[PDB]
């Protein structure tokens, strides 16, 4: 139960939550802060 709850918490880092990419270093490689803050705030809202 602990291992499957934790592997599911980790697999949820691969999820987009409506952001343009799953990986936060790729959003910050692609976008300027006026738009990257919208994409990152979808990832914050989802991961949190």
Partner 1 sequence: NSIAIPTNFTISVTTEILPVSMTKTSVDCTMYICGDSTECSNLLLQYGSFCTQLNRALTGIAVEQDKNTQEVFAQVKQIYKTPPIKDFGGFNFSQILPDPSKSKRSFIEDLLFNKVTKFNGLTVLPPLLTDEMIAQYTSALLAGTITSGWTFGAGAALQIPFAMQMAYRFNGIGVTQNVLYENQKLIANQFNSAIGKIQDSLSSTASALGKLQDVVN
Residues in contact with partner 1 by CB under 8 A are 8, 11-12, 14-18, 46
Q: Which two tokens stand for residue 37?
A: 């803050």
Contact assessment for residue 40 and residue 24, using Cβ atoms and an 8 Å cutoff: yes
> Cβ closer to partner 1: 28 or 46?
46
Rounded to a whole number of angstroms, the minimum distance from the CB of residue 32 to partner 1 is 23
Contact assessment for residue 14 and residue 37, using Cβ atoms and an 8 Å cutoff: no
- Tell the residue number behind the tokens 């705030």, with chain if given: 41
> Cβ closer to partner 1: 18 or 37?
18
Rounded to a whole number of angstroms, the minimum distance from the CB of residue 38 to partner 1 is 15
């Amino acid at each position: 139960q602990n291992a499957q709850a934790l592997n599911t918490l980790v697999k949820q880092l691969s999820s987009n939550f409506g952001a343009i990419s799953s990986v936060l270093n790729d959003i910050l490689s692609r976008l300027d802060p006026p738009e990257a803050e919208v994409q990152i705030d979808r990832l914050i809202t989802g991961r949190l």
